[PDB]
Design a protein around this nucleic acid. Sequence first.
RNA 1: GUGAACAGCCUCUAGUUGAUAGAAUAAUGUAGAUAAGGGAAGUCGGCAAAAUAGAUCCGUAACUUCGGGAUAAGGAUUGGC
RNA 2: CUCUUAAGGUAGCCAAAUGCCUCGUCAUCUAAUUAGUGACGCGCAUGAAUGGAUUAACGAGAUUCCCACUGUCCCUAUCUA
RNA 3: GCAGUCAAGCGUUCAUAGCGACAUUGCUUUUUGAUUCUUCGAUGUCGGCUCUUCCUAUCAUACCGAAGCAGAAUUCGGUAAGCGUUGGAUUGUUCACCCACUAAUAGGGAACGUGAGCUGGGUUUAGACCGUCGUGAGACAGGUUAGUUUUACCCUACUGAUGAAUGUUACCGCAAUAGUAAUUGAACUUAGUACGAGAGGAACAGUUCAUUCGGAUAAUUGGUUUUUGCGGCUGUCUGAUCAGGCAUUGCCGCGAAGCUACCAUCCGCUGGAUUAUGGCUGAACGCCUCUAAGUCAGAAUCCAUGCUAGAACGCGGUGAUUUC
Lengths: 386, 67, 136
Amino acid sequence: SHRKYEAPRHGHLGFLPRKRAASIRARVKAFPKDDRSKPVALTSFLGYKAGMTTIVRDLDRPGSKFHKREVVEAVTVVDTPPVVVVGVVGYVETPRGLRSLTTVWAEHLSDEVKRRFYKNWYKSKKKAFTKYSAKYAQDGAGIERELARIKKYASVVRVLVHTQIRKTPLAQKKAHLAEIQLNGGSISEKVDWAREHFEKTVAVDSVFEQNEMIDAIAVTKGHGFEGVTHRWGTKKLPRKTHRGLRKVACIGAWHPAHVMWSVARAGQRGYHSRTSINHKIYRVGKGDDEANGATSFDRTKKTITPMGGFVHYGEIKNDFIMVKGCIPGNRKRIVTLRKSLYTNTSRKALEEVSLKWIDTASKFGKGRFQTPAEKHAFMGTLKKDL
Amino acid sequence: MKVEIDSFSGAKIYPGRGTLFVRGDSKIFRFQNSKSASLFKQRKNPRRIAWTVLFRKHHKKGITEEV
Amino acid sequence: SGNGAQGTKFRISLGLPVGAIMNCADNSGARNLYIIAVKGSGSRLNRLPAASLGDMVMATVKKGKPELRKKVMPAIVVRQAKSWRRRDGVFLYFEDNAGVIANPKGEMKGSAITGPVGKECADLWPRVASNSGVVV
RNA sequence: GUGAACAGCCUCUAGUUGAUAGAAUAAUGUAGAUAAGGGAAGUCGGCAAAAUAGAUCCGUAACUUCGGGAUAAGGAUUGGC
RNA sequence: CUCUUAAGGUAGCCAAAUGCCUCGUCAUCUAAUUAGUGACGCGCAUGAAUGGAUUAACGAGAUUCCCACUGUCCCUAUCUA
RNA sequence: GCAGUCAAGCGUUCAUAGCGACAUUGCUUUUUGAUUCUUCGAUGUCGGCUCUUCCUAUCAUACCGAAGCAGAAUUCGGUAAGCGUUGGAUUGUUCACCCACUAAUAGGGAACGUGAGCUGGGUUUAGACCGUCGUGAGACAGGUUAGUUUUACCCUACUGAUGAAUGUUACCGCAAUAGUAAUUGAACUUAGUACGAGAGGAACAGUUCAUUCGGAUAAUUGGUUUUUGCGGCUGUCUGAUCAGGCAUUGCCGCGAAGCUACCAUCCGCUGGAUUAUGGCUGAACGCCUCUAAGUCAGAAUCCAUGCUAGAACGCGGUGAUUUC
């Protein structure tokens, strides 16, 4: 018989299977549609989630009650050292899909991507890309052959880049390689740009700017084998139940004489790949710049790094992106920041934000101070310092 | 943007941080944290809590250079 | 939010589910108000309708004048006791839960409000603001 | 010893130190707990749990077989020196 | 008035653990009550030691409401073994 | 139960806006019966709680057509099941009846879904009470009260998790197939405008918010708290002191980290093909006609974009490939 109270579906079925991702680095399953009139630029970037903080800024939303009034929006910081280009990749169109035809590398690869190519670096002779560096050997005859193949063919072109993990405070030492699509006219111009940028670095200032809406692509935090109640949001059964209440009661009807794919069972929660869209950039900052955390209104020389550092990550000594809200992944995870695919026009976008203050108080507790100078002024002299 | 003061402790309250309790008298109390909030609800006296600005003022501790 | 209400309301945390007794802050004769329903949120299985500051509820009177008791009437919530975040980023709460008796258009059966009132309610209801002395 | 107490809690004499172990800390459980705001809306039903709790002082209704009800209800106080 | 019985159901009590029709009707209790209480009574089929009506105190008895109290619930989360 | 044909009449006039007698044709299997095919070496026979799916005879929402449609409200009908359809008092109840909210509170199925998923209030063992019946033992789809809910470690299915082999190993990728998600409302303005004698009284565009849902995250607020981290308290033991043990995590206060909450915060895409319907040109039918050829626009529909997984017998590109 029928359900007796028509309630809605627990969980989303288009996020199935709720299984573990194949890697910590989530796949970019789409890049923006190419416009063969604009300059040549990257469509995405690679960074590491550092953490969160608090932001004051004045709202510019007319009709809202709180127009020209302050708000305290939250932000995620993604430390984003310059991404270095080591390869060029060419894809041609087939009735079975886009297919890689060939891929060209740089002459000198760093000991980070060379590290990526190994599972045991301490034992190895470190023989990788040696015969390729020897394939260059006078002018790059075979290399220009391959680039000419890419120019002739290659509906689209992708650049292989990697991260400066050593500049990042992680203990990993092994960089994250990724293919990033190039957008701009003339696959010839694309591949010439790549050849010019081989061995060279690329910073977020060229790829992202203020007030740009982006998508964030990462692997969700893992929580292991979880029960149906926290994994799907099922109602707990009453207190009076024999054999558990933190369960689903009816696991399907008699007929079909099967458990359906659509009933909630237990399993893996987290470590899924997720793509969250339309997160606005609030700051594109530079580790070269002292006073990253300063503002036109504040005028105090301070980095974004809180007192005691970002918890479980460290300090920020590189460039960074302060992006609105909450972004998938936990601290230290590689995040792929993608430019938006569609042109948004909503007045939530197109809203030029001007920050007013940045919280740089310690996140390792209830921080009361933003700078040690503030602390020293408030407290005075201590037994120490004396 | 403004920096408020904790009624109990005297600590600076930066934005998005702390609580505000409106009493039936319509007297507004501000707290940096649940510590000062809980001691207030317990109805303790800041002049007797030793880590407080009122205590340190009333006992002439550390300041010594303003008055 | 609310019929006869000037403007909209940003969400604020619900404190007052159906079944709930809040004090009365008006001089109408009533003393408490039993929230029985809420004009607003519609439906979810096993979800109780709950109210916040500024919401217009259906209420009865348990303690108070006999000519008010034993009949359902509209009311407006003016104090919550459950912390809520303003967009400016201060979580704040009152000492109690409190309402005023009203008509469906928003006018007040009473003439005075004892105690403070949230500016959310005061802004969404102008006849409340008129009879409101202190705000927050 | 505490305490009204052969209660509970700790200890001296005396006796045991036996009940398969190690490593980890998923779900679901068994047993124990805590929870903002609301407060029986839950459920056939307040089932379960919470709340109260000793002692001193005050104060104690209806009804009543005048014996009770009655620790009625309901309130205050309690340390150390 | 009439038929009729051994006698024709008395005092009292009731939609009661006894009332089919029935969620009886009126009031009260609630925002709302097939529940509860109080009353009504040609009562399918109440009733006097097959004991009637009542009853203070007592009850791990059945039951309704109120206060207090609470993760019963809104709506779940966390910790320990 | 639902739907048709017919058309006397109703509807001021007028059969068919909406209804529709006398009659008649049918579908349905959510009613109740009829039957007795299966099951009596047992298929756990009420209801609710929980969860999923399906159907559509569509309650709401999207788009439309008709009116006895001026507006507003309402009624009839179509394509449509994409999405949603509540909280409570009384009852064991299905059903029912009221309160209230709501855009709406539509109907149904899946062994009259669902007991190795709960519960066990009811029914329907044994105890006991009443009334009627009966000489009696005892009977009553009459009332009342009390009344053990067992087993999964197997196969499959489902959810997650590994994995041999296909020269080895490693990195970057493609994409078949499968799945898919967003929903609804209010206010402001449009506007006391259109419409209307007046009473009354809209809508498209736009803005701000909210409802339900979902996916994440933890700056803040809140919770949690063996950080047994700091402090405090009781009793006892260590001669006192200091510092500690026991009190089955002794108790209280604060409490970082982590986990976590519509109790917190962020986010939730754009195109094409179409249904209904409205139209173009235009014959059949030397006129007329959206249709027959051809064609335009067009729905919460369909397919993509996008999002999830990735074929463990589906592919590609690249690196290095072991002599002492």
